[PDB]
């Protein structure tokens, strides 16, 4: 034994790279998820199959299917995601929860994300828009080429703490010692790490790990937020902990601690990561930074504070964020487990298989997109947009199980653009790598941290 599911795609009839005995196709991840997705797409068309060890992954590319599974069949057959490693009590974090515990948690926290409560958090978020620039200032002063993900990470931290726990620190490399270093440690998993590679060939190793209590969210940090939450509950006799406590807090109590940790996870390094790309695009395109920078002066006259409405009422900003997201869809892949045998717009799909949508690949897909390689915002203006197909462009997923934090993500990032642009300009310096080159790991990240010249707009 060792090639269990390896007959499935030759049978059923789907093309794809032919699996090694124990490894499946994992050896093709030397380029990363993105590059591996591009090629299978080219070299196989619109459906293809591969094996992560002995897990069969079926990538689909037709919008109709991609909508059947993401939308039309969510609660039906494609409800859950792929288990990925020893997850401990975090098994109750919504993004990890399965089937019925999921829908429960989903409608239960979704009220916690509605607009208007977005409205309310804004003054809190803007407050670190201020902090960010008071900080971003000094680094431009010194004349030194600022590392983006450091100023942005901090802001993201600042905004997570404040909106998630009503803890207002200026982490931002200042009070960098209280509550900051556990949070700092909540980074995206790299699923091409040797650790995760091992657990994909030997998934029989997850339960063992589970036993030794070896969890993939580090215990140091989980103890802390778990402790730190509980002490906050009592004291309280806007803020995500707030909105949950009020949320009838059934809705379990030490299941609340799982949400808190997972919101930080999903939002920390993603927000600060996208913000970096956006500032890279706005240099190598100085023209766009200006077109955007003027729009901002137009909507709020010299330095005026950004606002829930000041924001939504900025067509060009919305274009720049959206175009950055196309090039760099942080998740790279949407992905869904098949709960049962089902038919789906043509092809049979057998129970057990993982259905995979190639976000990043569809976003650079010479079909739907012309000069797909190019940062040009105009793709998303009132004319040229909305003949672009959702289910193709999906940087936040789609359907019952999409990014619950999308609005908050966008809002948060814009308030940060505003403050920064309406106050700065950004210029390739010595180190600035041009073009881009993505990491060939399992994260959709720069490879060599983006560093830029920050230059105060007159002072
Ligand atoms: C940089 C911005 C962000 C991007 C690009 C992003 C992207 C995504 C994607 C692609 C998914 C999976 C969608 C699917 O399965 O179809 C997702 C899920 C999720 N995201 Fe985000 N996200 C971002 C920010 C955030 C923030 C700030 C939060 C926290 C408030 C958050 C919370 C979640 C949660 C809880 C899920 C899981 C929903 C579920 O499985 O029921 N995200 N996100
Ligand atoms: C970068 C990343 O995704 C992290 C999250 C889970 C982490 C692993 C969790 C288990 C672990 C325990 C150890 O004592 C050595 C390091 C390892 C093997 C970790 C290495 C880095 C990983 C793979």
Q: What SS3 state is found at 51?
A: strand
Mutational test site, ligand 2, from 86, 195, 206, 441, max ligand atoms within 8 Å of CB = 195
Distance CA 226, CA 257 (A): 6
Give every strand in the sheet of 146-147, ordered side by side: 146-147, 451-456, 424-427
Q: Minimum-distance ligand to the CA of 205?
A: 2
Work out which ligand 2 atom sits closest to the CA atom of 189. 3
Ligand 1 pocket check for 68: Cβ under 6 Å: no
CA of 111 to the centre of ligand 1 (A): 16
Q: Provide the CA 251 distance to its chain's centre, in angstroms.
A: 25
Distance CA 285, CA 377 (A): 11
Collect contacts of 300-309 with beta carbons under 8 A, ≥24 apart.
Answer: 300/418, 300/422, 303/422, 303/423, 304/422, 305/126, 306/126, 306/129, 306/414, 306/415, 306/418, 306/419, 306/422, 307/122, 307/126, 308/118, 308/119, 308/122, 308/411
* Cβ 380 vs Cβ 320: under 8 Å: no
Q: Given in angstroms, what resolution was this structure solved at?
A: 2.7
Measured in degrees and rounded to the nearest 5, phi and psi for residue 292 equal: -75, -40
In Å, what is the CA distance from 357 to each residue of 121, 329, 427, 457?
A: 33, 12, 36, 43
User: For residue 364, what are its two tokens?
Assistant: 């650079």
DSSP H helical ranges for 236-379: 240-246, 256-281, 286-299, 308-312, 315-327, 359-363
Measured in degrees and rounded to the nearest 5, phi and psi for residue 331 equal: -75, -25
Distance CA 355, CA 455 (A): 46
User: For residue 13, what are its two tokens?
Assistant: 């009839």
Ligand 1 pocket check for 403: Cβ under 6 Å: yes
* C-beta atoms surrounding 86 within 10 Å: 21
If you search the block for the tokens 């450091």, which residue do you land on? 150
Ligand 1 pocket check for 410: Cβ under 6 Å: no
Distance CA 427, CA 432 (A): 9
Mutational test site, ligand 1, from 95, 152, 266, max ligand atoms within 8 Å of CB = 266
Query: What kind of experiment solved this structure?
Result: X-ray
User: For residue 31, what are its two tokens?
Assistant: 């380029």
Measured in degrees and rounded to the nearest 5, phi and psi for residue 454 equal: -95, 130
Work out which ligand 2 atom sits closest to the CA atom of 188. 3
93 secondary structure, DSSP code: S
Bond prior to 389 in cis (omega within 30° of 0): no
If you search the block for the tokens 């642009």, which residue do you land on? 421
CA of 189 to the centre of ligand 1 (A): 14
CA of 138 to the centre of ligand 1 (A): 33
Work out which ligand 1 atom sits closest to the CA atom of 412. 27
CA of 395 to the centre of ligand 1 (A): 9
Ligand 1 pocket check for 395: Cβ under 6 Å: yes
Q: What are the residues whose beta carbons fall under 8 Å from the beta carbon of 134, sequence distance 6 or more? A: none
User: For residue 287, what are its two tokens?
Assistant: 């023209």
Work out which ligand 2 atom sits closest to the CA atom of 194. 23
* Cβ 355 vs Cβ 348: under 8 Å: no
Largest Cα separation within the chain, whole Å, is: 71
Q: Is the dihedral of CA 79, 85, 86, 90 positive or negative?
A: negative
Q: Is 34 annotated as a binding residue?
A: no
* Nearest protein Cα to ligand 1, atom 6: 396
* Nearest protein Cα to ligand 1, atom 37: 95
Measured in degrees and rounded to the nearest 5, phi and psi for residue 24 equal: 70, -125
Task: Give the β-pairing of 47-52 and 55-60.
Answer: antiparallel
* Cβ 139 vs Cβ 151: under 8 Å: yes
Q: Minimum-distance ligand to the CA of 220?
A: 2
Task: Give the β-pairing of 354-357 and 55-60.
Answer: parallel
* Cβ 90 vs Cβ 60: under 8 Å: no
Q: What SS3 state is found at 251?
A: coil
Ligand 1 pocket check for 109: Cβ under 6 Å: no
Distance CA 5, CA 24 (A): 9
Q: Is the dihedral of CA 97, 99, 105, 107 positive or negative?
A: positive
Q: Minimum-distance ligand to the CA of 401?
A: 1
Q: Is the dihedral of CA 286, 287, 293, 297 positive or negative?
A: positive
Task: Give the β-pairing of 354-357 and 334-337.
Answer: antiparallel
Which of 64, 61, 55 minimizes the C-alpha distance to 9? 55
Q: What SS3 state is found at 183?
A: helix
Which of 329, 95, 106 minimizes the C-alpha distance to 216? 95
User: For residue 379, what are its two tokens?
Assistant: 């793709």
Counting Cα atoms < 13 Å in the Cβ hemisphere of 291 gives: 15
In Å, what is the CA distance from 116 to each residue of 160, 226, 260, 399?
A: 18, 28, 20, 22
Domains and CATH numbers, the chain: 1-459 (1.10.630.10)
CA of 144 to the centre of ligand 1 (A): 34
Mutational test site, ligand 2, from 193, 209, 221, max ligand atoms within 8 Å of CB = 193
* Cβ 86 vs Cβ 35: under 8 Å: no
Ligand 1 pocket check for 245: Cβ under 6 Å: no
Which of 128, 129, 135 minimizes the C-alpha distance to 454? 135
Measured in degrees and rounded to the nearest 5, phi and psi for residue 2 equal: 150, -25
Distance CA 278, CA 275 (A): 5
């Amino acid at each position: 034994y060792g090639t269990h599911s390896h007959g499935l795609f030759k049978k059923l009839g789907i093309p794809g790279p032919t699996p090694l005995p124990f490894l499946g196709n994992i050896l093709s991840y030397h380029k990363g998820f993105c590059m591996f997705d591009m090629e299978c797409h080219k070299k196989y068309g619109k459906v293809w199959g591969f094996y992560d060890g002995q897990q069969p992954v079926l990538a689909i590319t037709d919008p109709d299917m991609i909508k059947t599974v993401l939308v039309k069949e969510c609660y039906s057959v494609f409800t859950n995601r792929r288990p990925f490693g020893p997850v401990g009590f975090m098994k109750s974090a919504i993004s990890i929860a399965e089937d019925e515990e999921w829908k429960r948690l989903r409608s239960l926290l979704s009220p916690t994300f509605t607009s208007g409560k977005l409205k309310e958090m804004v003054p809190i978020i803007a407050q670190y828009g201020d902090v960010l620039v008071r900080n971003l200032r000094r680094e431009a002063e010194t004349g030194k080429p600022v590392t983006l993900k450091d100023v942005f990470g901090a802001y993201s931290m600042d905004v997570i703490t404040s909106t998630s726990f009503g803890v207002n620190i200026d982490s931002l490399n200042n009070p960098q010692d209280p509550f900051v270093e556990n949070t700092k440690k909540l980074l995206r998993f790299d699923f091409l790490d040797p650790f995760f590679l091992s657990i994909t060939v030997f998934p029989f190793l997850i339960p063992i790990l589970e036993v030794l209590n070896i969890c993939v969210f580090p215990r140091e940090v989980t103890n802390f937020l778990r402790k730190s939450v509980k002490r906050m509950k009592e004291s309280r006799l806007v803020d995500f902990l707030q909105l949950m406590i009020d949320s009838q807090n059934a809705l379990s109590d030490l299941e609340l601690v799982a949400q808190s940790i997972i919101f930080i996870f999903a939002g920390y390094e993603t927000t600060s990561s996208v913000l970096s790309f956006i500032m890279y695009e706005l240099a190598t395109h100085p023209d766009v930074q200006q077109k955007l920078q003027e729009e901002i002066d137009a909507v709020l006259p010299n330095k005026a504070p950004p606002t829930y409405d000041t924001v939504l009422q900025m067509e060009y900003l919305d274009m720049v964020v959206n175009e950055t997201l196309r090039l760099f869809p942080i998740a790279m892949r949407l992905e869904r487990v098949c709960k049962k045998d089902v038919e789906i717009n043509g092809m049979f799909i057998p129970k057990g298989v993982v259905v995979m949508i190639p976000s990043y690949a569809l976003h650079r897909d010479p079909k739907y997109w012309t000069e797909p390689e190019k940062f040009l915002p105009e793709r998303f203006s009132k004319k040229n947009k909305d003949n672009i197909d959702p289910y193709i462009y999906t940087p936040f997923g789609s359907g019952p199980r999409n990014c619950i934090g999308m609005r908050f993500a966008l809002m948060n990032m814009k308030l940060a653009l505003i403050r920064v642009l309406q106050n700065f300009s950004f210029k390739p310096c010595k180190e600035t790598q041009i073009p881009l080159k993505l990491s060939l790991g399992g994260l959709l990240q720069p490879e060599k941290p983006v560093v830029l010249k920050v230059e105060s707009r007159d002072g």
